[PDB]
Amino acid sequence: LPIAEGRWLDISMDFVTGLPPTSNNLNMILVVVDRFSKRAHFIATRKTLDATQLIDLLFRYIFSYHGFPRTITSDRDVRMTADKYQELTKRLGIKSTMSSANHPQTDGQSERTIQTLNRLLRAYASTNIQNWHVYLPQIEFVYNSTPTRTLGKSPFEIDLGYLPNTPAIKSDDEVNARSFTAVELAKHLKALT
DNA sequence: GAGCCCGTAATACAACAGATTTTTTCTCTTAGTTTTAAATTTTTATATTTCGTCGA
């Protein structure tokens, strides 16, 4: 699919199920992957919270509070083939670009994130049933800070510039400790783009 | 060629592809039922076993 845009104007998301319940939360995987920077957010949820009517859009917007996208790529799921979802996205100026009747490879990068997520979920899933909903933000923070392979830079520092706290600045420069005056961010952030 | 060390660095290969209940015999395990044979008495002559005691 088209390569990249201005910091996740193209985006992907998908669902996987089979997760064990903790508070009647047996979906808990609404993974949204910031395709350009591969920031790859995923927020806990459930099947019965919404069906794209009341609360699904609300945490979709609290994710989208950090920037509206311009293109979705998703599956033929009933939570996104509804008339309510397509029309609201059209009024938002954001395309749908659904899948092709059990062809999840259109959502490949989100599903590849899930494949990376599942291993880390098993790593952090010792307390499988009792209390583990605190681990998804932990898995997010670990996975974003870890450098990938296809780009050589961690997806956290690709968009935000700097790395998270406890600086372990590499031997390139001090440029990854970019937390200072913001009027010159545009030039080098476009260079990183 | 010929190989070796070591230090980087490419490199095909595979996982994400809704998850769960059933379906049909089998095989330990563990608790409830059923039929039946057996623990203490008389007893009667027979015999052998094994104690138990006594004797010069």
Resolution for the entry shown, Å? 4.0
Side-chain half-sphere exposure of A93, counting CA atoms within 13 A: 4
Statement: the CB of A100 is under 7 Å from strand B = no
**Checking DSSP bridges between strand A30-33 and strand A41-43, what pairing results, if any?**
antiparallel
Statement: the CB of A128 is under 7 Å from strand B = no
CA A169/CA A150 separation, integer angstroms: 21
**Three-class SS string for chain A?**
CCCCCCCCCEEEEEECCCCCCCCCCCCCCEEEECCCCCCCEEECCCCCCCCCCCCHHHHHHHHHCCCCCCEEECCCCCCCCCHHHHHHHHHCCCECCCCCCCCHHHHHHHHHHHHHHHHHHHHHCCCCCCCCCCHHHHHHHHHHHCCCCCCCCCHHHHHHCCCCCCCCCCCCCCHHHCCCCHHHHHHHHHHHC
CA A9/CA A5 separation, integer angstroms: 6
10 Å CB burial of residue A37 (0-12, 13-18, 19+) is: buried
Please report, rounded to whole angstroms, the spatial distance between the CA atom of protein residue A6 and the C1' atom of nucleotide B47: 118
Radius of gyration of chain A (CA): 18
**What nucleotide is nearest A109 when CA is compared to C1'?**
B16
**Three-class SS string for A115-128?**
HHHHHHHHHHCCCC
Tokens coding A83: 């008339």
**Residues 6+ away with beta carbon under 8 Å from A29:** A15, A16, A17, A19, A42, A45, A114, A117
Q: Solving technique for this entry?
A: cryo-EM
CA A28/CA A44 separation, integer angstroms: 4
